[PDB]
Amino acid sequence: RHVQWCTISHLEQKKCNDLVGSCNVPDITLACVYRSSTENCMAAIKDGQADAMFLDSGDVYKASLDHYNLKPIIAEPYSLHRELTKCLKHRQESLGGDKMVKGRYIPQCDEKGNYHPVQCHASTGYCWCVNANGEKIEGTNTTPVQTPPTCPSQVLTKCLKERQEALGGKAIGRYIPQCDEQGNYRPMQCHGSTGYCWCVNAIGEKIEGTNTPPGNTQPTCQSHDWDTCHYAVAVVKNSSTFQFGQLKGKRSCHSGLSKTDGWNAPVNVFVEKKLLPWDGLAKGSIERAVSKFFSASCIPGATETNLCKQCIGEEEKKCKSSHDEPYYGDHGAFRCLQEDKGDVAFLKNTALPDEHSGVYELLCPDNTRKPLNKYKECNLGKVPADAVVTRKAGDKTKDINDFLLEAQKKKCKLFGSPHGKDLMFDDSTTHLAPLPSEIDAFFFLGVKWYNAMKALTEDVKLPSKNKVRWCTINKPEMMKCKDWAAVSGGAIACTEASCPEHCVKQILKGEADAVTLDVQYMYMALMCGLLPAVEEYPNKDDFHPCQIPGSTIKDFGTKRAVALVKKSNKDIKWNNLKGKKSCHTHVGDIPGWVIPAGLISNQNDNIDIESFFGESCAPGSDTNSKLCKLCIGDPENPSTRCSLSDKEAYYGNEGAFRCLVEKGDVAFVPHTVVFANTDGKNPAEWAKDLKSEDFEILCLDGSRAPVTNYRGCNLSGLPPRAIVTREESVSDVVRILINQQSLYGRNGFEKDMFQMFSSAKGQNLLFNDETQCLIEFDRQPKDIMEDYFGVRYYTAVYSASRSAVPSELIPACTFKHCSNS
Numbered sequence: 048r049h050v051q052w053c054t055i056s057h058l059e060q061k062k063c064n065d066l067v068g069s070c071n072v073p074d075i076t077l078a079c080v081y082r083s084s085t086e087n088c089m090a091a092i093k094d095g096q097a098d099a100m101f102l103d104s105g106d107v108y109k110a111s112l113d114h115y116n117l118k119p120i121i122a123e124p125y126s127l128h129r130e131l132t133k134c135l136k137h138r139q140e141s142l143g144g145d146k147m148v149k150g151r152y153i154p155q156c157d158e159k160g161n162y163h164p165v166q167c168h169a170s171t172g173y174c175w176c177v178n179a180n181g182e183k184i185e186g187t188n189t190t191p192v193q194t195p196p197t198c199p200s201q202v203l204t205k206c207l208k209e210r211q212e213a214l215g216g217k218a219i220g221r222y223i224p225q226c227d228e229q230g231n232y233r234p235m236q237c238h239g240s241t242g243y244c245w246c247v248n249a250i251g252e253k254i255e256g257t258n259t260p261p262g263n264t265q266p267t268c269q270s271h272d273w274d275t276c277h278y279a280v281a282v283v284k285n286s287s288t289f290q291f292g293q294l295k296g297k298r299s300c301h302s303g304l305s306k307t308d309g310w311n312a313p314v315n316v317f318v319e320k321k322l323l324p325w326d327g328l329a330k331g332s333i334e335r336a337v338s339k340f341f342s343a344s345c346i347p348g349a350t351e352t353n354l355c356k357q358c359i360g361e362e363e364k365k366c367k368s369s370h371d372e373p374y375y376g377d378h379g380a381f382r383c384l385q386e387d388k389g390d391v392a393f394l395k396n397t398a399l400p401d402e403h404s405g406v407y408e409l410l411c412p413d414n415t416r417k418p419l420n421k422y423k424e425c426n427l428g429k430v431p432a433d434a435v436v437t438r439k440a441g442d443k444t445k446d447i448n449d450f451l452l453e454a455q456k457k458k459c460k461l462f463g464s465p466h467g468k469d470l471m472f473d474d475s476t477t478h479l480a481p482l483p484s485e486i487d488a489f490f491f492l493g494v495k496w497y498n499a500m501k502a503l504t505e506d507v508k509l510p511s512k513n514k515v516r517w518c519t520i521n522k523p524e525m526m527k528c529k530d531w532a533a534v535s536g537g538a539i540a541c542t543e544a545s546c547p548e549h550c551v552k553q554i555l556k557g558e559a560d561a562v563t564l565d566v567q568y569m570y571m572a573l574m575c576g577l578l579p580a581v582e583e584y585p586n587k588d589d590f591h592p593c594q595i596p597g598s599t600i601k602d603f604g605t606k607r608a609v610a611l612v613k614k615s616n617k618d619i620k621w622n623n624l625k626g627k628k629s630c631h632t633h634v635g636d637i638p639g640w641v642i643p644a645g646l647i648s649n650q651n652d653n654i655d656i657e658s659f660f661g662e663s664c665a666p667g668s669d670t671n672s673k674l675c676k677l678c679i680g681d682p683e684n685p686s687t688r689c690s691l692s693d694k695e696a697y698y699g700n701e702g703a704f705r706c707l708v709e710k711g712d713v714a715f716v717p718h719t720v721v722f723a724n725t726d727g728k729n730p731a732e733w734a735k736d737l738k739s740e741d742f743e744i745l746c747l748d749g750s751r752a753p754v755t756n757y758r759g760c761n762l763s764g765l766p767p768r769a770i771v772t773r774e775e776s777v778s779d780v781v782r783i784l785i786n787q788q789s790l791y792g793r794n795g796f797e798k799d800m801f802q803m804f805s806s807a808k809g810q811n812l813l814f815n816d817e818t819q820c821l822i823e824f825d826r827q828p829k830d831i832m833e834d835y836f837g838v839r840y841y842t843a844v845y846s847a848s849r850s851a852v853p854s855e856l857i858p859a860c861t862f863k864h865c866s867n868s
């Protein structure tokens with residue numbers, strides 16, 4: 048196995064070569080491939096000449112475009128503010144679940160708020176071991192007849208672990224971190240031999256401008272500092288006197304034309320403060336406008352002559368996006384100021400001097416100057432993280448990740464070099480971790496910075512708030528949507544995706560505005576931050592809420608999942624169904640499977656629903672399992688047993704009810720099944736005038752009730768399907784859809800011209816055909832998860848937790864960003 052790293056300079060190639068020799072990672076060999084600039088390396092990776100390189104966030108954006116098609120895969124983790132510990136958040140969530148779902152696991156947290164390594168389930172007496180995330184170590188479960196297991200101690204905090212590593216078993220003459228009671232870094236740190244002291248934030252990162260030799264006064268160190276994003280800053284010497292608003296005509300040093308801290312951040316501020324006569328691509332390029340602002344600068348990668356005048360690279364290396372240009376990068380821009388080739392340098396806080404005293408200070412955009420350690424209040428914005436990138440195909444992602452993980456475990460010299468600073472990686476980097484598997488530049492940079500960088504390259508025409516771009520998931524839906532657009536007078540437009548999850552992505556990225564989602568997709572949609580705008584109201588009995596919008600809805604009419612049993616079986620209750628014979632509509636059905644399996648796993652330590660029951664019939668299971676012993680199959684024996692078709696006699700709503708009456712104790716079905724197949728409503732012989740009063744439903748409290756009281760004695764009611772959109776577009780989508788519905792709904796004024804809830808092109812296109820109307824979602828002041836799902840469903844299916852991962856999109860769309868207001 049090989050990893051080919053692309054280097055951009057003679058110096059970087061030298062450092063990469065040293066690592067080939069010094070860093071011994073078994074199974075994976077590092078190799079180094081030289082190119083003359085950042086852009087030539089991005090092309091080498093696209094072409095397969097190399098596999099990986101580390102990019103500034105600005106280049107991560109550029110590399111994500113179709114010319115290169117690269118994606119970020121590895122980066123240093125950062126924090127925005129202090130958060131609750133995971134155990135305490137989990138406790139709060141589980142305690143907020145539906146109390147009618149009894150016997151649920153409530154985590155046990157220790158005096159620091161972390162998980163006790165031994166976790167126990169009070170209602171079942173089972174205990175197990177967990178990792179620091181509170182996730183069960185599989186295979187450690189012990190029954191209550193046994194003593195609690197012996198579980199390894201918690202992994203130490205960063206500070207306590209670095210302290211243990213610094214001691215290394217018996218220390219003298221080296222820095223040993225000082226930790227607080229909670230195991231985080233004390234704000235002030237001192238070197239036990241040199242007498243120097245400095246400040247660190249809560250995860251131990253040094254605050255620049257605070258390093259203090261012994262015998263001098265230290266700057267005040269801020270406590271509980273969990274803001275670890277990097278900040279773009281403008282650095283100047285204290286010997287000059289101009290302010291930020293007088294930058295016109297000065298000399299400047301920039302980390303690079305494509306760097307976020309050296310270009311996007313200052314240019315964004317220049318434009319907002321109207322220092323730069325530029326607003327759109329009608330006034331030419333921004334680089335040309337910047338060329339007229341400064342008298343002479345060094346901006347590696349630039350083409351304008353005066354913007355390369357201050358660079359000192361020799362011959363063709365001059366003004367290159369490469370360390371062979373001595374003023375390239377954060378530390379090159381600072382050197383350019385230090386050597387008086389510029390009056391101001393644009394870089395980020397992590398490249399500022401560590402020492403408190405000296406001739407440098409910060410140039411604030413509010414026309415003041417402030418000391419180096421005040422960058423959090425004297426900056427040009429937070430900037431995104433930087434990242435290792437590879438091809439979008441990801442053919443080398445695993446080898447790249449494995450090599451860097453092992454190299455860091457072995458403490459290879461990745462993050463420094465005698466040859467120079469910020470070679471291969473930023474010298475300030477301490478750890479590189481894998482990004483979410485579905486991350487891309489949009490989700491890595493965040494929508495605010497992604498759009499901000501795009502705005503510098505093109506005039507982004509923001510779509511109209513009077514048009515709803517509807518996302519369709521198949522060709523018939525696209526065609527029905529084009530007919531809607533033709534009658535809509537411009538209110539409706541159409542986009543195409545392959546599946547509802549890709550529609551959610553389009554809405555997040557501003558390519559579409561709305562889509563209707565099945566219940567099985569709403570957890571993902573809500574975790575990515577979309578909101579229900581309107582919902583499909585399916586109650587055929589009551590049309591009052593459709594005629595008079597905003598009025599009270601007595602019954603929304605969604606299905607209720609119930610546990611159906613016979614009146615003769617007096618001994619069966621909810622709490623004793625273990626080992627009994629059950630009948631499910633099919634695997635994957637929400638009322639017949641997802642809701643029952645969710646409650647069973649919630650109350651029995653995630654024990655398989657296959658193992659919970661004795662002999663069941665659930666179409667879709669393995670034919671040899673206990674879940675297919677009850678399944679008959681085709682009465683016209685061909686074997687089509689336990690099959691997901693009508694060939695199975697026990698398939699579907701009617702089939703699961705047949706399984707109950709013929710050979711079962713309980714059936715998991717919607718509440719409408721028993722009424723639609725008893726009282727002689729089904730002509731077949733198996734239900735020869737079967738009586739509805741012959742059956743009852745099981746309540747979660749062990750009691751029972753007649754099938755008529757399904758509203759108060761059910762496993763869970765389902766939420767309605769929802770039309771989702773971005774938070775800032777809810778009001779527009781509601782307004783446009785309600786107006787369209789007054790024209791083309793079931794009582795629309797122009798329903799002869801178009802019908803939203805039917806089509807000759809197919810069934811359930813865009814909306815479900817049995818929809819009565821769309822009802823505005825009335826957002827309540829509570830968690831959107833509980834608001835949309837209802838507490839019962841939220842608890843039964845997701846344990847009332849925001850930590851479930853039913854789609855691998857969730858870790859990417861919840862990745863946190865370094866954005867400004």
Ligand SMILES: NC1=N[C@H]2[C@H](CO)N=C(N)N3C[C@@H](OS(=O)(=O)O)C(O)(O)[C@]23N1
Pocket residue numbers: 582600603764766767824825826827834835836837838839
């Ligand atoms: N805001 C809000 N309006 C309701 C409508 C349905 O009537 N849409 C939902 N998805 N909901 C879930 C229900 O929850 S439940 O607990 O009543 O089942 C609810 O009635 O609260 C509701 N929440």
